[PDB]
Design a protein around this nucleic acid. Structure first.
Lengths: 55, 87, 83, 87, 83, 54
DNA sequence: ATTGTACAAATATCTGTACAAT
DNA sequence: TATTGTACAGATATTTGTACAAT
């Protein structure tokens, strides 16, 4: 889990999008006003959604 | 461009599985192998980690959120212990 | 799932962060080289990861599904516990 | 100081196993059960989370880093689906 | 494992954060109510959790133990991979 | 994973310590000079060490 | 549609230090 | 002993909309 603040995340958004796809990990970007988000690769999101279903 | 890779028997079967049923995994594994060959065990894509305990001497990179490429490098020769999580 | 492109997400990052937190929605952010991302609130992430943790292992998923069915049909054990 | 608790078969096996082999686990479990009865399914200790997919309707609290108490509340009666991870 | 108490940790938190990063050592911080913690660098935590992930499942742990043993006893398969 | 910056962690250190013990959770403490740390309960550390060192 | 880079003024963090009270 | 909540205060970093330039 990468942790970055909002300003760094915006300053380096493309690099972070590349990194979460290349490394299959995630970024929590922090905010001063309790609006944190997590950024993950779309392929990881889709993979995790699939294993959530009871097969 | 054409690499010589050592697989454990169990990692070979899992790679074969992916070759049949999941081409995206094979492509990802191959990109990790290229990175390992170009930059060494600890540098490059996949979040390389140095493993501990009885896995000491081996490294892991992320294939995706679930699966790990567990490998070592013997004088620039890559060996794969695992490329798929076993339940 | 809201869909936005990378440039919009860069120029409007704080609004996206606000939206997925206030509306509990998610956004997919596209890029031209296909390494897209999805963005969700930290609370939505924790919730998904906890369910993923229990579902990831097929035997634990089966164990949970059978236990919940057992509780459903009444094949249970009831005890008083001093806490 | 006393609660009526419904177990699934497998969850009761694992509760008794913890009684015989790990008293620390039974203490934390009982502490979680107390917090569920006092504060409701979603408030209190153990990072309570609302479960999804076919586990919708149930909740989880952390017994420790590895094990989860998976439970629901049906008419203020606590039902336990699980208290030990199954591999 | 440096041992300290809560009051020392509170009063010297930045020093402890700098030590566990520069010397890759760990601090146990003691409480009088038995709510003790361990502090480590993010790098050490990531490394620890990744091995833990591979070892936590007994079948995956055994799969790794057996596969590493095969490689070390020369029971292997060679593949040529275009990359 | 709870995320707090250094100043908050110092102002609320005790709360965090009982938090990671009550919740079997962790805290990452960020810092401006790239010296982040992670805080976990001692019993969780001992459990994990036991698991990964068989 | 893309990325790196820029301005700038309100708010937040930083960090040693330390006072009560336990 | 060791504990907690609490506070000061200059210095430094984060915040956020806006937008140029070149692709």
């Amino acid at each position: 889990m990468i942790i970055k603040n909002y300003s760094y995340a915006r300053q380096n958004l493309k690099a972070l999008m590349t990194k979460v796809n290349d490394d299959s990990d995630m970024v929590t970007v922090t905010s001063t006003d309790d609006k944190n988000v997590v950024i993950m690769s779309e392929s990881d999101y889709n993979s995790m959604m699939e294993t959530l279903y009871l097969q | 461009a054409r690499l010589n890779i050592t697989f454990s028997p169990q990692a070979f079967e899992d790679y074969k599985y992916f070759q049949q049923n999941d081409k995206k995994m094979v492509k990802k594994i191959n990109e990790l192998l290229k990175s390992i060959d170009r930059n060494g065990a600890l540098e490059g894509i996949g979040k390389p980690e140095k493993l501990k305990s009885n896995l000491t001497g081996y490294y892991s990179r992320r294939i995706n959120h679930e699966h790990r490429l567990v490998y070592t490098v013997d004088d620039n020769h890559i060996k794969i212990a695992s490329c798929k999580y076993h339940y | 799932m809201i869909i936005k492109n990378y440039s919009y997400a860069r120029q409007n990052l704080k609004a996206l962060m606000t939206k997925v937190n206030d509306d509990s929605d998610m956004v997919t952010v596209t890029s031209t080289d296909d390494k897209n991302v999805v963005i969700m609130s930290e609370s939505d992430y924790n919730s998904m990861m906890e369910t993923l943790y229990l579902q990831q292992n097929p035997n634990n998923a089966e164990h949970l599904a059978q236990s919940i069915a057992d509780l459903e049909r009444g094949k249970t054990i009831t005890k008083d516990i001093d806490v």
